[PDB]
Design a protein around this ligand. Sequence first.
Ligand SMILES: *[C@@H]1CC(=O)C/C(C)=C\C=C\C(=O)O[C@H]([C@H](O)NC(=O)/C=C\C=C\C)C/C(C)=C/[C@@H]2CSC[C@H](C1)O2
Ligand SMILES: Nc1nc2c(ncn2[C@@H]2O[C@H](COP(=O)(O)OP(=O)(O)OP(=O)(O)O)[C@@H](O)[C@H]2O)c(=O)[nH]1
Ligand SMILES: Nc1nc2c(ncn2[C@@H]2O[C@H](COP(=O)(O)OP(=O)(O)O)[C@@H](O)[C@H]2O)c(=O)[nH]1
Ligand SMILES: [Ca+2]
Ligand SMILES: [Mg+2]
Ligand SMILES: [Mg+2]
Lengths: 427, 439, 57
Amino acid sequence: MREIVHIQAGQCGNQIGAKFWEVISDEHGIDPTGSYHGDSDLQLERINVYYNENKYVPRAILVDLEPGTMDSVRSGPFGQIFRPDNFVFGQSGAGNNWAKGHYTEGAELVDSVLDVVRKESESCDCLQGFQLTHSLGGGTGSGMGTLLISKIREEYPDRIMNTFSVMPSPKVSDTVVEPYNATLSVHQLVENTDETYCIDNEALYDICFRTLKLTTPTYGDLNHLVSATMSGVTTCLRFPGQLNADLRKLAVNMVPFPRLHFFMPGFAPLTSRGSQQYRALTVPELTQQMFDSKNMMAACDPRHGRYLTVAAIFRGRMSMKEVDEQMLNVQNKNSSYFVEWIPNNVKTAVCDIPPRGLKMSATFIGNSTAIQELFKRISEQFTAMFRRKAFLHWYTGEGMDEMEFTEAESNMNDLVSEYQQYQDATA
Amino acid sequence: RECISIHVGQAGVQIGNACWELYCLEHGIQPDGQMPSDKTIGGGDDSFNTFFSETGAGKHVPRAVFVDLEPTVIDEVRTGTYRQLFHPEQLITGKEDAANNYARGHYTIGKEIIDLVLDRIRKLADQCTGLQGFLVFHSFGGGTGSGFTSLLMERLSVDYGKKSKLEFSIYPAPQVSTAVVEPYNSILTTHTTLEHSDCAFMVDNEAIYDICRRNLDIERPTYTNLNRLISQIVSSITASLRFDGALNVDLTEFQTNLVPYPRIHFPLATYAPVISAEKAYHEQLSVAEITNACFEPANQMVKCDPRHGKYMACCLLYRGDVVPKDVNAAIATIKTKRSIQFVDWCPTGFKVGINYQPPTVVPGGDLAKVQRAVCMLSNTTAIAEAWARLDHKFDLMYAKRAFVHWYVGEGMEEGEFSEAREDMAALEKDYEEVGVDSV
Amino acid sequence: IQKAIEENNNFIKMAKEKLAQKMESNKENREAHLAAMLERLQEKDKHAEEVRKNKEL
Ligand SMILES: *[C@@H]1CC(=O)C/C(C)=C\C=C\C(=O)O[C@H]([C@H](O)NC(=O)/C=C\C=C\C)C/C(C)=C/[C@@H]2CSC[C@H](C1)O2
Ligand SMILES: Nc1nc2c(ncn2[C@@H]2O[C@H](COP(=O)(O)OP(=O)(O)OP(=O)(O)O)[C@@H](O)[C@H]2O)c(=O)[nH]1
Ligand SMILES: Nc1nc2c(ncn2[C@@H]2O[C@H](COP(=O)(O)OP(=O)(O)O)[C@@H](O)[C@H]2O)c(=O)[nH]1
Ligand SMILES: [Ca+2]
Ligand SMILES: [Mg+2]
Ligand SMILES: [Mg+2]
């Protein structure tokens, strides 16, 4: 009815993309062969948003410049659910170089990706738009992913473009050029996406390590959090409901100025199994946790800025009256942190189906000016390198000019100033 | 003297569902459209024929079009309980909605379906021997209810001239709203529609929500709870058109008294009794009780305080076991006791109608079945408070142009926002001016 | 009666014309927003050509 086409690019993008599909397939009662075996009609009612149709096949395109991650996806759990012809991969790799993904190797592959995008799009009853999963700190997801965004946008200019964009952190990768690849990518996202979930590896790491007490978090551990979040933030798109039920309604509610389209996602509950013995899982606990810095998947403290807009989704069996009351309370006690010139800027949905293994959960989507803290962190790492022209030859050797770096940096600094402007504005 | 109902977008459609179900129960029409008590097969000129046409096979078919820019709400009508009541062609859908954006409803998406909707309304009109006018049900806040309604009302002025157009308009509340931009959409549609509408009954979702919570003891009202109450109010208002009787007074005659100047066309509706089965049990609520309840601000369908404005008209629409003697005694008491100041240029007499047909309730509803009910329609300067609240929310966002790019992106200009807001300022000022004393 | 006819006709006429003018202005505006968007995207394709040319030296 209102289809979304999903693209996953590069290593990170394919890894979190595969977990997204495993988790939502389980939620909708779809098994690894594509057969429906669930128990609630809620599961099938909007299945067409994500699955073609006695089997259900993800509307999903898997892209990479080398075969290895996609080979493991294919042999992973749920790997035979994907359409075989929707795997598009080269052999070269991108060498963790954005320029190779965006301008050289990625450019050589992009038309064959577009062929598949078009085939999926053309058999849609009424395509809403696109969701991309990728990292910003590598080469393929970052460089080729942003290339695909601009190419798709040319052919589908009035459709929504949404990303799940994984931001780098020195706590997770020591690859030294990550700040360059991320700054060049943010430059593209600012101009060419409608809505971006900022999934910060810094925050995923700190949640794993400090809250869940995992001494040495794996990508697996990080991705489990991401898949919880991605499930949460797509709940309104794929289950019956009132609020934010499609990509464009979400954008209209969440994006007051076109460039300010970078969301801080958050998930509750996030409590260690040992602390679970002490703390009950209740609506007030979810509500308190979802507005806490420690539950945000971007490493920014919302109390260091203000909220332009917020979407709160609760999942599971619970009292609607108690939800309304807690959501009013949390707004009242936090009133300073919600801009006064956007009245009624927090919306609340409830879906009766919880995530697997929880009685209830909540998901937060914040458009907060405190997201400037993430861009500033990237910006500081970028400039420490660029001031010394470190490692530029990898990018100029692909034909880029220093001017493009200066321009990406300036654009990202301008984004930061714009968040500050609206943070400081009053009624 | 036919009336054609048009139900636009989700709110207009779901309220239409509730209204048509209630109308069928009030007239004895089954879900398959059969009406065993109607002995004229295939036609006639009964009062109920204002709202229902008849087929030769005995089907009583609403004079109604339902339209929505996406299909999923109208699909429930098409597959649900009353699916046989409507001809398929009366239920019209597109595939992609207006995304809470007036610009999409009035322009980008609306324009693709407007011709077809006008075609279908024309086919209804063509079966009427004396069409009196239209009743249009819509939200203020949604993209379709705002923008498509506006487009449709402009197009109907062109195709039907000054034939009567009345609205039932759903004014937004935060407890059930779905968009941050609802103020913008409300002001845009109020501006665009104002010269095309003869009379508009606003229903504030927050007033209804509150009434449901307070008087029906519903902890967290749903649209279903809200819409069942709204339908009773709508029913009270249209009952004069659908039933006859010696003391029935047509809605158009109330209209004469309600609308002193073309733009001053927004009556305040107040309804009583709203009570649960459990409280209504063993308690007979007299004509005096239900009448005094109409001057309680808590029972009003729009939050505002009439005690702090002036009246330009007061109409009482009774239904059920009500005789003028009891009415007159009740009005006499109320006049000695309440805050009822008229402007100096109007008569202070209350205008009364009585329909004998008792009120009906839908199975599994919240409202007690009662012997007598009343709907007061007043023209008070206090209703302007509702415009001031929306205007203020508009001003807060507009000063920063928050969300305006979504509208501009669909082809609108800033000048349309300032024109709409200027007209609303003029309307607020019109409401002040009419309440000032004559020199 | 002629006056009443004239004013009803003039009301129709003016509502018809105002609407035609808004739907045209709306259309041209929306089209221009789209054309600008596509022209930015095309500038980018041209820039990527230059990069790949710059590399070949
Ligand atoms: C996770 C699947 C998996 O492999 C790991 C397992 C078996 C369980 C993980 C649970 C987990 O991470 O739980 C967290 C959180 O610690 N839970 C609580 O805080 C619970 C109660 C708190 C009370 C005060 C929540 C979480 C991220 C769950 C997600 C939901 S999406 C499905 C994944 C699968 O788990
Ligand atoms: N009383 C009542 N209000 C409703 C109902 N459905 C929606 N609303 C209100 O209407 C507004 C949202 O507009 P909708 O009618 O859903 O939107 P739409 O006209 O379908 O427009 P789009 O979906 O944007 O194309 C909010 O203020 C909702 O609270 C309903 O059935 N009853
Ligand atoms: N959360 C998460 N981050 C990952 C994963 N794989 C790689 N990354 C991060 O992504 C960046 C490296 O980019 P990568 O996706 O490997 O390169 P590409 O294959 O060229 O797109 C670094 O910031 C890594 O920490 C993964 O599965 N999950
Ligand atoms: Ca008959
Ligand atoms: Mg890698
Ligand atoms: Mg709708």
